[PDB]
Design a protein around this ligand. Sequence first.
Ligand SMILES: CC(C)C[C@H](N)C(=O)O
Ligand SMILES: [Hg+2]
Ligand SMILES: [Zn+2]
Ligand SMILES: [Zn+2]
Length: 876
Amino acid sequence: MEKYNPHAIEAKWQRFWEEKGFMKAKDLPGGRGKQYVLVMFPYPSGDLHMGHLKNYTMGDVLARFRRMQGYEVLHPMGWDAFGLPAENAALKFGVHPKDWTYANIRQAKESLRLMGILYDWDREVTTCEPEYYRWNQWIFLKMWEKGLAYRAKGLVNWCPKCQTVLANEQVVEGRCWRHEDTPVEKRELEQWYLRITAYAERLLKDLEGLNWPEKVKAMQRAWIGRSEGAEILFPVEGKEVRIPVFTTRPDTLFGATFLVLAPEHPLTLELAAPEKREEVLAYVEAAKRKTEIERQAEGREKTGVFLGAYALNPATGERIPIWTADYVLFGYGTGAIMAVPAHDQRDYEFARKFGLPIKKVIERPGEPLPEPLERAYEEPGIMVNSGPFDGTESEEGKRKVIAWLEEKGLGKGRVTYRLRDWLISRQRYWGTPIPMVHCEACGVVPVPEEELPVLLPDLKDVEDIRPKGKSPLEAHPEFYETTCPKCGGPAKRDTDTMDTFFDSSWYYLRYTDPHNDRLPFDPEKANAWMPVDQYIGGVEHAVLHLLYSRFFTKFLHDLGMVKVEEPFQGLFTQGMVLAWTDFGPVEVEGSVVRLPEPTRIRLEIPESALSLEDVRKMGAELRPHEDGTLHLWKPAVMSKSKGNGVMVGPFVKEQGADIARITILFAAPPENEMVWTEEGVQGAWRFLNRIYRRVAEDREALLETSGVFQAEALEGKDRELYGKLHETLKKVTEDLEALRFNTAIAALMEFLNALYEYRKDRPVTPVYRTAIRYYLQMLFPFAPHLAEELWHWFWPDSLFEAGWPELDEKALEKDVVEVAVQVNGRVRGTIHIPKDAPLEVARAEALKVRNVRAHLEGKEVVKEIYVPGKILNLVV
RNA sequence: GCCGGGGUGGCGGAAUGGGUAGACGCGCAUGACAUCAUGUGCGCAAGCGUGCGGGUUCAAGUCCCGCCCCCGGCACCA
Ligand SMILES: CC(C)C[C@H](N)C(=O)O
Ligand SMILES: [Hg+2]
Ligand SMILES: [Zn+2]
Ligand SMILES: [Zn+2]
């Protein structure tokens, strides 16, 4: 009997599929129903290890499966080559972006191949290639003609390291999404913006009937931050200008004891009295250089400064002082807020800090508010000290005060969103050029459609493209010196480049027509493949990619190019992958595990000594090491940085693909985080082995046996197996359609074990033949090699043309099941009787069990509950 | 503090229209020549066992009431 050998069959079969062209997506899916399985394309930066493969595998399992079922599958793959992620990688290794990009793409593309993964590469797409970004620019123009793209000056986020501006969504915890060790800063500058906010309502209203992870949906709702309320106009004293503010508590208007303007608000300086004019300019610019991190380090000791001007409370008419404090966001509402310390803990704290007035106008139902208040009372209540509103309820009060302000023309009801606009212009070389020219006479002029693409200046000098503070294209007149396509005089091309997230925002749409030189894609085509039925990815693109794509699809929908309005119908979010990591040497002494500083620091814990127990309790262990000392190991995220990756190729060579697949899809539940391990792999070896042995050993017999027969005529073990078979066929089919792989696999390990047992007694019957035909077909998605291999010992064509096994309902039916006999609620034993056996039969069969405990325990019995399914309770 | 999801074996994890808890796998332990085969929730035992405390029921991981700890999210309203 031969043995299972990966190398001998793996690469073999891989070529076979590639050449046979099975996962080649059709152009316009017929009435066969389509399936668009797609995983987020990668950032060509770094080598591919196992942690990275978890997502593509699943997409492969899924794609293969759907393919067998007959659906027209589209399982594209490509590269998110342009932007900061890539360029920053290259620049780190002093390599030229274009070289570094095509280097990874080559490697990465090999790994995937070495894994059994099949794409329809006739659709590969590289974002940084002119053939692609050509269209980023064509889109950008169409957005401009619809006034969705524009320029504007103001403070923006700046990443010193990246040496460019970042969108708000690229500022995770006031730090760069890439350099979580670099505190983002603020700078005055004029950039480009996409009016995503013009889609704030739809972007929210459509999240409703969506089948996505709660976590994601939640986050977007918070990022969009819709907030119903009112815009109130406070007349400034002496001047003509009226200052507007936003609030959700118009019912506390009489509580307004002072206004507050954002340090960057226009009037903050145009109102500050001369004697203060200096103190304001000092603080205004002080709040600027203050990084978000620095702000969030003050707690509630917020700062502020009195301008020197006053305003009139459009409700009472009294003169309230006007201040300015960083806690107010120029980018939110109207950069101005009416302060009501009595009903807002943030304002309250401020008021009490700078000796400002606190005035209650909302009374708590029942137990009166302790005067003087010691804390702002926010909850609803009754309106007091509020002119003609006294005795009204906060709730009804609002719409009233609103309708009121609206009548007097002092304010209006208005909805505002937290969502700020999208800042896409970037000061980096490696990126799409913004198709705009800056004529001196006409101003900002768009490049003609046909004059596209605006090719990127070829710069083969690393030390040149390196960002120093402004677009590298600024020192290249050969590029930025052109003529205005409007008047004709001398103009200047835009030196800034679109951000990476601009191209990743519609690729899924590009794969549907990867070679279109007239349009970014043919509507007819994309309409036949969208939306994306399944979308494997990660949650780190919650407010980013998953946000922007929705915008872009809505925009493209309005141009009438895409019929849907939500790109990703389904969306899975796989979990991290960990791996036992070496943390360093330790000094064991009995039970005391003293830690040398280098190790401790790596563990990142305050303790400098632990007990053999704590080391265990924290999930670590002590191993012997090549340096002849004891090292401490403990899982950790598998990453290059950690140097605990498990390289795809170096692995498949020594082990196998299918082995890595199984070890990955059975480690734990997909969404959970697994821990790649030796034992994990060893187990996959054994599972794959036995699958092989079993079919090998009955190969000859199988060949001379026919797999045809009449099910109803089956009896005994035969009939038994036939059930267990379809029992499995069902669990497996469902588990797949629900992305629950671990169990689909185990469902197979279990039937395998079933097949072995069946041989201990029964020969090699037709049913058994069929049992293998089905086992293989089902195994395909997980171990496509070993399956195709064994499958050919008895069948001609590839598993790809076998179809998915048809489940047989009638077969799932039980007869003579195993009921459990319990005495007085406690399970005393079990018996074997039909699913229909009447109480009399069960009672009987039970009264004489192994230990006849049902008898020794039931020497009285009163009531007897009997669930024909599997229960018989003898209530003593 | 609010919101979503979670606490099950030495380990990852199965099973909730109440109805042999712990499938499948790992690990361990014996029997055979790294691998198969058998066993493996805990306790010597009475007996006990799905985060804690009550309760409903012949029967509770599943249902009711009160509560703790964990993970993730937190814009507005309340
Ligand atoms: C779909 C893309 C936005 C995914 C992103 N390029 C990444 O690989 O992290
Ligand atoms: Hg390129
Ligand atoms: Zn950065
Ligand atoms: Zn001009």
